[PDB]
Design a protein around this nucleic acid. Structure first.
Lengths: 65, 797, 122
RNA sequence: CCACCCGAGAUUGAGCUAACAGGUCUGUGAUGCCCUUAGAUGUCCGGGGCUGCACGCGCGCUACACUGACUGGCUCAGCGUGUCCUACGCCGGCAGGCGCGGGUAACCCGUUGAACCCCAUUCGUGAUGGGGAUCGGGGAUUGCAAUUAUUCCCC
């Protein structure tokens, strides 16, 4: 199957705790603000970050975690 | 025992059989006991044996246990007065302090109440007298041996009493509910579990089926409704600060009572909601999920109007602080509204949403971006409730008119909410067109929502696929003439040369959506228009054309099926002619279309399938995983289709195989194609294809195990794994050595790369046979891998 | 009309069956004064002697006694008798009377109502 | 986790017997020495000993008693057991035999019928009837065999 990596976990936690305000629900808007925010090496890591943060903003906006 | 079971002096023989129960030999006593039980259950002799019961119990310290075992085995087959007298005898013997005789007596009561005796054996008055006579014991709270079976026997007795006369049973139930709540204070978890299970079973079987006969209960009820309210106040006073340990069980009991009784118990049920809301205000509450489930069950039973009259939302417009204490109510309402009215949703949640959105925008334009985000998230949360309200509305025939223009404007100019609105529409349809006036209203507004949804899907950039699924179902529920009109307009837009490629693709997607919902003439005209498009050099146009052909052939009944049986010859000719010029993505829908014409293919069609075979195998090794899945499903489908063209299934399967056998001879990628096809076929047609024939194919695979290409070796390893899984160990044992010899002399690099497949194969072989045989017949290095498998078999245990 | 309680002490358990009777306290078929440890016979009579003869006129208590020794035995019997009186006056008689007798019993000796929680340690 | 729409791609290809201190144990040397009617405890047969006893260091049991000992009566448990654990009757001072049943076990032993303790009799401050060793005779089991007392019972 497929599993999320721990570096993606910690980077997305940093993004959530830092700039949740400009983040939203759309995938591409989250991806572009994510590539705007941080120091970023790779495309695939960015896309994994964007997908994970989009899914967890689908999660946490229903209720706190 | 046999003689008396098969058949004045007979009473003497029965007395002689009965009188030696008290014989001290454990083997004689058990034989006599089983004989008496077989004679009675295989009756005019019940009075005599019950009199013997009472007499020689009253004469009697070890025979009482045996005699109570017979009473356990024989209480249902007794007359009513003798049941009463034996019950008095059991009370007289549990007046003593002995644990064993009390346990045997209560087990006898368990067997008596469990068998559900008729009116001749146990009456309602006698059941009530026995039940009320059992209330004197309850030694303490925490003995844990007699208490569980104690409330079990009057659980069964209360079930029987409700079954005999329901009003008296419901009348006497709530004081037992109060005693159950009282004995939920026990320090043992088994007492709590037994009480919870007993009260849950009583509520589900004795109270729930009589939900309509009781009717609505208020604070001034008279009959069994008062009893309903009074075990409600028992289980609600079981929520106080005395417990702190049974709160999960009490919440489960509250949840099942809400599901059982809420719709008519709503006037008295409010203070329980207030107390439940007050419990969630605790600093550290570990039963948050259970309380949320209980409140969700209450909302599901009643509906949010009375819940919000009881526990109101404090997010009504302008608030002072920023910590909403009842913000869990909106997820509860979203997750658990299923059978409410849509008019409440309109008249309560529309102006409040408008005011919160206006306040959020006014605060966002004023600089404060923290409160505005909270208000926007709140209004999004409270208007995700619409799919919940669209689950099963009871007034959607009159309240859907009040939301049509609102939902049209919201799906037009409010993008962030659009998906939910689409979902709501889909949700409504998927479970709301059961009646006919409802579906008529949905069609009457469908004629208005269709241009809006078409313009939404056709705009440039957006959630296109949710709108497309909504359009698909929403057009399956509408009238055919407007479908024909919009299909004609979409065909005009497609055939217009002054349209861009994105617009052309969007209108082709609309054609895909409109295709299965039209009539036979419109479908035939659309098929005539789309038929020249199958040879287009653009992969997108061919993909949409093949999707149209798949969608018109997808419906098992309707105008599409009549179109298929009308134009099967032309469809076969066109699909065989367009085989050469099909693009790589277009393979994925086309196979499905071929799938959609294999399941209803007549006997005189072998040439079509035997011409489609190499395309299907080359699609089993296509790039797209969806094309591979469709090709495997199509292989299974034509394998099933050849099982209908002849009388012998095995011979037809052999013909189907010799139609695909030469594919192991040609190109290397075609060889891997055919090995993968045989691997997929071996898992579906395991024994019917014939074990010896399997062996032959297996031998050929060993020759293909000698190939240089990695793909052929991988496919051969997969086939060997499937064969080891499928074909029998007795037939394996003749052919273990040859296949494992072919594995052994593979290569160094091939063994190193494919180490996990060989490891799994050796694991399966060692599991299915002896370790020493595979150890001996393999070469040296493989031995090491072999021995590792052993600790799996050692340490998976 | 009747209650069944128990009194525990170490291992000894004495089950008291209390009924509206005629003023007889029966312990395993024997009265209170004819139990063998006559040196320790006052403890068995402390509820009866302390609380008076008056409202025991219509109480029949049958005590079935099993286990333990002799001292723990008679203590279990006396605590079962006291708990039987408390339970009977809780169930069929008013609340204030049983509260009063509980207050008097706790004022005299705590073990007359609650059992000794310590037992033989392994 | 499954399936599906869109999408070219929802997973198509390359690289990764070796290492262990993670456990632990008797296979490969034409291995160095020392021995082999000086058997690295050679097999069996018969009888003894491990208890033997002047003495020291110590674990324990019984006591020195009157809050006791004897006699009779009284009434209360649990951990465990068994095909050798025993229920019943007879012959028995008495250990024990004889005829019979159960139990491969919350069942039959076994409500495990305990003992100090209690209630009555006698003894009455002395090497006493306390305390019991060490010896002398008989009897009965256990065992191929009780002599260097196996064990128990009666003076």
């Amino acid at each position: 199957g497929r599993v999320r990596t721990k570096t993606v976990k910690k980077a997305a936690r940093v993004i959530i705790e830092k700039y949740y305000t400009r983040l939203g629900n759309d995938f591409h808007t989250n991806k572009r603000v994510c590539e705007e925010i941080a120091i970023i090496p790779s495309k695939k890591l960015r896309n994994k970050i964007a997908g994970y943060v989009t899914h967890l903003m689908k999660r946490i906006q229903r209720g706190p975690v | 025992a046999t003689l008396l079971r098969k058949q004045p002096v007979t009473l003497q023989v029965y007395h002689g059989l009965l009188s030696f129960t008290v014989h001290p030999k454990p083997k004689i006593r058990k034989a006599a006991q089983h004989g008496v039980c077989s004679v009675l259950k295989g009756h005019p002799a019940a009075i005599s044996t019950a009199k013997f019961c009472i007499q020689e119990i009253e004469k009697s310290a070890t025979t009482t246990l045996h005699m109570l075992t017979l009473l356990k085995d024989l209480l249902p087959c007794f007359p009513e007065g003798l049941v009463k007298s034996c019950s008095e005898t059991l009370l007289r013997v549990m007046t003593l302090s002995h644990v064993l005789v009390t346990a045997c007596a209560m087990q006898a009561f368990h067997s008596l109440f469990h068998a559900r005796p008729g009116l001749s054996t146990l009456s309602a008055e006698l059941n009530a007298q026995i039940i009320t006579a059992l209330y004197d014991y309850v030694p303490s709270e925490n003995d844990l041996q007699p208490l569980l079976a104690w409330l079990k026997v009057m659980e069964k007795a209360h079930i029987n009493l409700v079954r005999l006369q329901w009003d008296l049973g419901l009348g006497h139930l709530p004081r037992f509910f109060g005693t159950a709540v009282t004995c939920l204070l026990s320090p043992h978890s088994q007492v709590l579990t037994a009480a919870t299970q007993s009260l849950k079973e009583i509520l589900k079987e004795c109270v729930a089926p009589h939900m309509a006969d009781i009717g609505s209960v208020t604070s001034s009820a008279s009959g069994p409704a008062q009893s309903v309210a009074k075990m409600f106040r028992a289980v609600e006073e079981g929520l106080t600060y005395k417990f702190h340990a049974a709160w999960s069980s009490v919440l489960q009991l509250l949840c099942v009572f809400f599901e059982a009784c809420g719709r008519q118990a709503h006037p008295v049920m409010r203070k329980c909601l207030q107390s439940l809301c007050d419990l969630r205000l605790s600093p550290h509450f570990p039963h948050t999920a259970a309380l949320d489930q209980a409140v969700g069950a209450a909302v599901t039973s009643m509906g949010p109007e009375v819940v919000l009259q009881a526990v109101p939302l404090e997010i009504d417009g302008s608030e002072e602080t920023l910590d909403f204490p009842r913000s869990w109510l909106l997820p509860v309402i979203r997750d658990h509204v299923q059978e409410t009215r849509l008019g409440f949703f309109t008249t309560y949640f529309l102006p409040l949403a408008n005011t919160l959105k206006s306040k959020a925008m006014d605060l966002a334009q004023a600089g404060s971006t923290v409160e505005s985000k909270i208000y926007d998230t709140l209004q999004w949360q409270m208007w995700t409730l619409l799919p919940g309200f669209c689950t099963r509305p009871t007034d959607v025939a009159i309240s859907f008119k009040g939301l049509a223009r609102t939902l049209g404007m919201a799906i037009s100019e409010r993008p962030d909410l659009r998906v939910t609105v689409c979902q709501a529409l889909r949700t409504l349809i998927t479970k709301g067109c059961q009646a006919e006036a409802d579906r008529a209203e949905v069609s009457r507004f469908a004629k208005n929502f269709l241009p809006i949804l078409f313009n939404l899907y056709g705009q440039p950039v957006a959630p296109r696929r949710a709108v497309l699924e909504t359009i698909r179902t929403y057009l399956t529920i509408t009238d055919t003439q407007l479908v024909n009109s919009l299909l004609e307009k979409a065909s005009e837009k497609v055939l217009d040369p002054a349209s861009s490629d994105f617009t052309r693709l969007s209108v082709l997607d609309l054609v895909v959506a409109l295709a299965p919902c039209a009539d036979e003439a419109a479908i035939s005209k659309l098929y005539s228009t789309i038929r020249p498009y199958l040879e287009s050099k653009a992969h997108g146009v061919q993909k949409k054309a093949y999707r149209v052909l798949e969608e018109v052939c997808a419906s098992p009944q309707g105008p599409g099926a009549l179109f298929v049986q009308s134009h099967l010859e032309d469809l076969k000719k066109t699909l065989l002619d367009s085989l050469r010029s099909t693009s790589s993505p277009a393979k994925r829908p086309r196979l499905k279309c071929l799938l959609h014409i294999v399941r209803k293919l007549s006997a005189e069609h072998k040439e079509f399938i035997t011409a489609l075979i190499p395309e299907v195998i080359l699609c089993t090794k296509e790039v797209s995983v969806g094309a591979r899945k469709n090709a495997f499903a199509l292989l299974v489908e034509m394998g099933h289709a050849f099982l209908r063209f002849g009388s012998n299934q095995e011979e037809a399967l052999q013909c189907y195989l010799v139609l695909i056998y030469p594919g192991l001879v040609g190109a290397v990628t075609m060889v891997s194609c055919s090995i993968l096809a045989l691997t997929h076929l071996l898992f579906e047609f395991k024994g019917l294809m014939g074990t010896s024939t399997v062996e032959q194919l297996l031998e050929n695979v060993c020759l293909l195990l000698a190939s240089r290409t990695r793909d052929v070796v991988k496919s051969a390893l997969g086939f060997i794994k499937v064969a080891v899984t499928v074909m029998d160990v007795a037939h394996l044992a003749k052919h273990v050595q040859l296949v494992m010899e072919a594995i052994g002399k593979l290569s160094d690099d091939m063994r190193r790369h494919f180490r996990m497949k060989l490891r799994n194969l050796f694991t399966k072989f060692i599991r299915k046979f002896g370790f020493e045989l595979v150890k001996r017949l393999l070469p040296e290095e493989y031995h090491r891998v072999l021995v590792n498998i052993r600790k799996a078999e050692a340490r998976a245990k | 009309q009747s209650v069944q309680v128990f009194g525990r002490k170490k291992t000894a358990t004495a089950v008291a069956h209390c009924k509206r009777g005629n003023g007889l306290i029966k312990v395993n078929g024997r009265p209170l004064e004819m139990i063998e440890p006559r040196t320790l016979q006052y403890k068995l009579l402390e509820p009866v002697l302390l609380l008076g003869k008056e409202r025991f006129a219509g109480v029949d208590i049958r005590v079935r006694v099993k286990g333990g020794g002799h001292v723990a035995q008679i203590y279990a019997i006396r605590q079962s008798i006291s708990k039987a009186l408390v339970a009977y006056y809780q169930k069929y008689v008013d609340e204030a009377s049983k509260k009063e007798i509980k207050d008097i019993l706790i004022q005299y000796d705590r073990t007359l109502l609650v059992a000794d929680p310590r037992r033989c340690e392994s």
